[PDB]
Amino acid sequence: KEEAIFRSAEMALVQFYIPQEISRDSAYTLGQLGLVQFRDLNSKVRAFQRTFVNEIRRLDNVERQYRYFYSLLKKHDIKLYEGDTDKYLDGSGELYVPPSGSVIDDYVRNASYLEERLIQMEDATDQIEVQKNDLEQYRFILYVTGVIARDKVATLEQILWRVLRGNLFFKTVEIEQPVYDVKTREYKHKNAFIVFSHGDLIIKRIRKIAESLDANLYDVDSSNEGRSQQLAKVNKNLSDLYTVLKTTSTTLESELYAIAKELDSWFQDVTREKAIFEILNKSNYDTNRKILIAEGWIPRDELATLQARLGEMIARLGIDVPSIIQVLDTNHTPPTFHRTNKFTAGFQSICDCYGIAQYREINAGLPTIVTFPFMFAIMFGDMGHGFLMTLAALSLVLNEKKINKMKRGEIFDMAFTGRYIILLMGVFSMYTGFLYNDIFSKTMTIFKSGWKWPDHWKKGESITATSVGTYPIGLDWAWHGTENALLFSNSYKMKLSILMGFIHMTYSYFFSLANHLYFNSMIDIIGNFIPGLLFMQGIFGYLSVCIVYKWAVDWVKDGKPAPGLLNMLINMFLSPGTIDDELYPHQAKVQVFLLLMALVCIPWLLLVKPLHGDIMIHQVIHTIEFCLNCVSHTASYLRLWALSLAHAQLSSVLWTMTIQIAFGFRGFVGVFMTVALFAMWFALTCAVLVLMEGTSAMLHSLRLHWVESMSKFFVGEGLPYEPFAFEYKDMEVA
Amino acid sequence: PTVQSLSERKYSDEELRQDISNLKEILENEYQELTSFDEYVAELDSKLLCWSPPHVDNGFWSDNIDEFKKDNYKIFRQLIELLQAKVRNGDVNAKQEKIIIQVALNDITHVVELLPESIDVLDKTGGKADIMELLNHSDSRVKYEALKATQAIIGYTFK
Amino acid sequence: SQKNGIATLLQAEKEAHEIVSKARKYRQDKLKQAKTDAAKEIDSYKIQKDKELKEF
Numbered sequence: 001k002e003e004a005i006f007r008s009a010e011m012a013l014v015q016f017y018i019p020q021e022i023s024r025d026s027a028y029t030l031g032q033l034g035l036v037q038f039r040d041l042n043s044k045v046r047a048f049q050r051t052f053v054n055e056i057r058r059l060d061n062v063e064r065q066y067r068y069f070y071s072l073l074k075k076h077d078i079k080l081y082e083g084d085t086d087k088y089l090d091g092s093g094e095l096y097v098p099p100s101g102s103v104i105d106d107y108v109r110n111a112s113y114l115e116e117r118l119i120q121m122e123d124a125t126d127q128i129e130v131q132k133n134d135l136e137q138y139r140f141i142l143y144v145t146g147v148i149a150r151d152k153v154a155t156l157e158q159i160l161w162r163v164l165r166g167n168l169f170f171k172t173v174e175i176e177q178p179v180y181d182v183k184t185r186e187y188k189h190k191n192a193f194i195v196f197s198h199g200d201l202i203i204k205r206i207r208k209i210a211e212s213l214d215a216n217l218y219d220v221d222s223s224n225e226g227r228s229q230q231l232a233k234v235n236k237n238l239s240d241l242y243t244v245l246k247t248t249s250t251t252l253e254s255e256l257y258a259i260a261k262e263l264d265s266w267f268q269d270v271t272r273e274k275a276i277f278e279i280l281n282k283s284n285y286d287t288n289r290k291i292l293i294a295e296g297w298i299p300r301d302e303l304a305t306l307q308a309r310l311g312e313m314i315a316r317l318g319i320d321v322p323s324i325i326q327v328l329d330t331n332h333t334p335p336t337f338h339r340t341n342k343f344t345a346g347f348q349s350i351c352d353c354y355g356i357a358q359y360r361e362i363n364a365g366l367p368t369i370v371t372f373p374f375m376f377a378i379m380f381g382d383m384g385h386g387f388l389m390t391l392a393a394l395s396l397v398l399n400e401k402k403i404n405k406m407k408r409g410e411i412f413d414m415a416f417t418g419r420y421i422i423l424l425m426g427v428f429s430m431y432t433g434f435l436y437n438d439i440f441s442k443t444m445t446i447f448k449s450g451w452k453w454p455d456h457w458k459k460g461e462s463i464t465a466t467s468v469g470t471y472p473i474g475l476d477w478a479w480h481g482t483e484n485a486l487l488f489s490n491s492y493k494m495k496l497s498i499l500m501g502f503i504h505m506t507y508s509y510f511f512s513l514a515n516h517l518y519f520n521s522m523i524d525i526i527g528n529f530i531p532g533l534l535f536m537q538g539i540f541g542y543l544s545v546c547i548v549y550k551w552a553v554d555w556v557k558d559g560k561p562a563p564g565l566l567n568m569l570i571n572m573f574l575s576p577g578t579i580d581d582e583l584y585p586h587q588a589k590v591q592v593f594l595l596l597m598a599l600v601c602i603p604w605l606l607l608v609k610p611l612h613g614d615i616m617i618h619q620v621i622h623t624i625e626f627c628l629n630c631v632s633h634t635a636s637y638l639r640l641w642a643l644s645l646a647h648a649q650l651s652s653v654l655w656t657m658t659i660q661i662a663f664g665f666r667g668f669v670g671v672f673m674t675v676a677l678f679a680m681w682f683a684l685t686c687a688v689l690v691l692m693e694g695t696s697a698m699l700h701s702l703r704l705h706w707v708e709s710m711s712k713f714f715v716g717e718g719l720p721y722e723p724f725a726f727e728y729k730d731m732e733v734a
Numbered sequence: 735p736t737v738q739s740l741s742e743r744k745y746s747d748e749e750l751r752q753d754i755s756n757l758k759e760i761l762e763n764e765y766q767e768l769t770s771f772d773e774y775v776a777e778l779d780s781k782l783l784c785w786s787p788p789h790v791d792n793g794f795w796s797d798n799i800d801e802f803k804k805d806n807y808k809i810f811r812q813l814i815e816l817l818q819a820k821v822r823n824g825d826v827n828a829k830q831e832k833i834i835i836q837v838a839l840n841d842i843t844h845v846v847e848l849l850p851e852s853i854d855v856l857d858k859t860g861g862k863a864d865i866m867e868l869l870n871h872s873d874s875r876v877k878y879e880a881l882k883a884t885q886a887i888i889g890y891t892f893k
Numbered sequence: 894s895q896k897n898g899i900a901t902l903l904q905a906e907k908e909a910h911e912i913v914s915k916a917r918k919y920r921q922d923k924l925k926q927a928k929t930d931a932a933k934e935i936d937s938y939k940i941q942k943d944k945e946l947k948e949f
Contacts, residue, residue, distance in 0.1 A: 051744075247881050289909070
């Protein structure tokens, strides 16, 4: 049936005994199955003396050869010819178990043969290119004779005339076309260096000076017939070199194109056998007996599937020797396994970056998928910015298949990882903007206002409003653009944030309840849950319920003044019964009663758990940490309010100083003014707001889940579960 | 190569390992006996050249190349004559003829690098033109050897 | 059981190793017996040759 994951599933430690002959095939099929984590067996044996070292270094050499081939591919005009298909074939290996085969030796031999042949071909091509460059200079035709860059010919002439104070003939001519310089590796201009002078020593000095200026010289025949014969011989040699160069280039290009058609497949495969041999050395192999034997961690609810797959492999192979496996129930802590769909993978990863949920308790990864986006939206509520961010997410979701086969890069790396979080994030932003009725800090008018202005408002005079109705969803749009609006919004958020944060605390602490109840934990529940729950309720839940009742009762209509919220909170701690105006009858009795209850929670939280105490030192620090931490988180819940105001008035000022100036005088120049100002406003609204403060509120709503939620029930770190599997990583680069 | 790969493979049985070692030693002795310049000369005397000598004698065994240098590149002239006869026969499309031509081209390329003087003999006998024509042959396996030989002749001797 | 199965596998591996060692010892004993039989055959050939010479 189903094997979904709240926090984990019961997983088993299984030991493997396998025959030597089918050991590699079993490792390959297990790797393409990828479900078991092998614990440490021969970690004492260091790397330089492992069992499979020689094939490890052989595979390293062939990997280097493949990297050399890919270097040639990128140097030429081809890249990943099979990347479209080979990547899919490796990805299609899931639930397919492709055969591996003993063609690894053939792969190694063919790779070495291709490597040496390509090395020889590359050496031939570079040498023949050097010859071609040399002959082009030698092809020049009109004592000493040579060619040199046309930039330095004047300097050469001047220095020659200076160092040789005597006279000499100079008949330099610029080359018709630039020639690729060997040293400069650039197609710079060139010029002839024909010169004639008497004196053997003078000629030798001139030759040395010319060679000192990176000038190449040739034995140009003075006689017309000899020069013509030399030119004809050079032309014939150049034609032969052109022919052989074309043949070599065609052969090299064909070889590289053939290699690129399957290089990705061999690279992915050889990486898979690299992992296979790494796991092989990780085993407890011993050549004195049945060679391979090892142990591993498997989920219990797929041991039957694993055994069936192994039996299918054994049927595929010719060996009839059984290789069954059995569970070994040790006392060690099992790893932590979390199945997750694409809609939850990023959520769970971000949630457990704090720590690893050790076992079959209740984790925090599941509630995150909903609490995270809604906390961010509470801190971010706006139809405009939320709509932009949701369109970004949606455009990152529909083209998922396009993005799965490409690298996002340092602009969208975290975005690619958080590809689905921001979608539900933007949906909750839709909600919060529906409630926080501002759109780019401007309020919508879809619903009729419940508050009516006076029929005759004086221009410039203060104007009051009478509550002649109520607004169905969100704040009444009459609040927009009023002095008292901000205060009303501060009070409302205060209370909204405090209620949401308290309810999040209660939800996490009930997760702690479920965690404790899953195990026996009879001492743990009585020692920690009930006293802490009673304290937390009696203070903060009482605050919440009296807030709700304060909202429920029509204080203006009832005649009774609305008591100060924080005073009704704290005069409990100062002097019970000191009530300016009770919320409900018998209020002071409730105050003293549950205040005494909260006070006696502390000895309850301190005494009952350490009973047999040796763990009293841990218990007392846990108790004080819990109480101060509860009050700290309850206070921290006010920065949802803080971010809400930051976003609201930041959008307000941005709109007021961009769009409220865009219209200007509404002239012909006003059109350009509003175009430029809306361009600036959009650039800011995106880059500043939805990136900077969008990420800020995202990360702060994430701070919620780091500390306030998980510190209540995340007991500690557990062993991560990473089964031996291939992933087709590093298609081209690593 | 199969025995080399088997020796590389980690056979579990000690008896199998000893047998593999003995077979490898026998194969190495046979290869060393195949590295005889006299054997290469005898093979070149007849047709259907084998591929085991020409990887050492026209190569690491520079003594064979030095001997082939004698009598004014007598062995090189004989090989060039054999190649010219094979080309002129018109049966290059034959698989056996293709293998013989490939072996001859490999030997000629090995000899040319060692003895640059043989380039003049090849040019006088038309070996250069024959090699250039063979560079366009459809036999890709023979084409690679022909291109290597042309690069060796043009790259070193023609320079 | 799992531990019992591991012990049985170890015992089977030890038995296989002992069988291989016994086969090697049998091969060595066969070589020694071949040497002894060669000595006996040499003695028999010497006796037969002496008998043939005496008969001649």
